[PDB]
């Protein structure tokens, strides 16, 4: 399924993911497109920072959900 | 019309605004009520940072809409 990741610079990234993918899996997919290391990425959804070890499903992230990305 | 402006600290203030008010006008009303100068305010609605030069109606901000305020 597709989700969106929006930056404060105005970019909208798309990722193909599964509900069981982990946050680090997501950050690696961002790295693959943007070159930003996962440890420089803060992902936000529903007013919460997303944590390593958890899945998208843990946060109720569903099809065409939008995450926000800020860089360290 | 009344709108609400909330911060991440949980405070919610009420403002009287018009559909044709510009974002900079709304920031001037926040300054009038809370004393926060406009260059310290970032206003957010429906996943966008509101841009000066546009009106509330341009963003489909309606009666009793809630905007988020982040202070810089």
């Amino acid at each position: 399924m597709q989700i969106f990741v929006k930056t404060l610079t105005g970019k909208t990234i798309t990722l193909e993911v599964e509900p069981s993918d982990t946050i680090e899996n997501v950050k690696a997919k961002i790295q693959d497109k943007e070159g930003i290391p996962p440890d420089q990425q803060r992902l936000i959804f529903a007013g919460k920072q997303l944590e390593d070890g958890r899945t998208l499903s843990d946060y109720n992230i569903q099809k065409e959900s939008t995450l926000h990305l800020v860089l360290r | 019309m009344q709108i609400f402006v909330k911060t991440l600290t949980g405070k919610t203030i009420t403002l009287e605004v018009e559909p044709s008010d510009t974002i900079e006008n709304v920031k001037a009303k926040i300054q009038d009520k809370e004393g926060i100068p406009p260059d310290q305010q970032r206003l957010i609605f429906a996943g966008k940072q509101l841009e000066d030069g546009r009106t509330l109606s341009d963003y489909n901000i309606q009666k009793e809409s809630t905007l988020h305020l982040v202070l810089r």
Binding site: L8, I44, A46, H68 | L8, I44, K48, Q49, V70
Partner: peptide, 18 residues
């Protein structure tokens, strides 16, 4: 710091959406 401000901006954007 800019980082803290950006985190707050992202939290608010995210909240305002969903």
């Amino acid at each position: 710091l800019q980082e803290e401000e950006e985190l707050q901006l992202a939290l608010a954007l995210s909240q305002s959406e969903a």
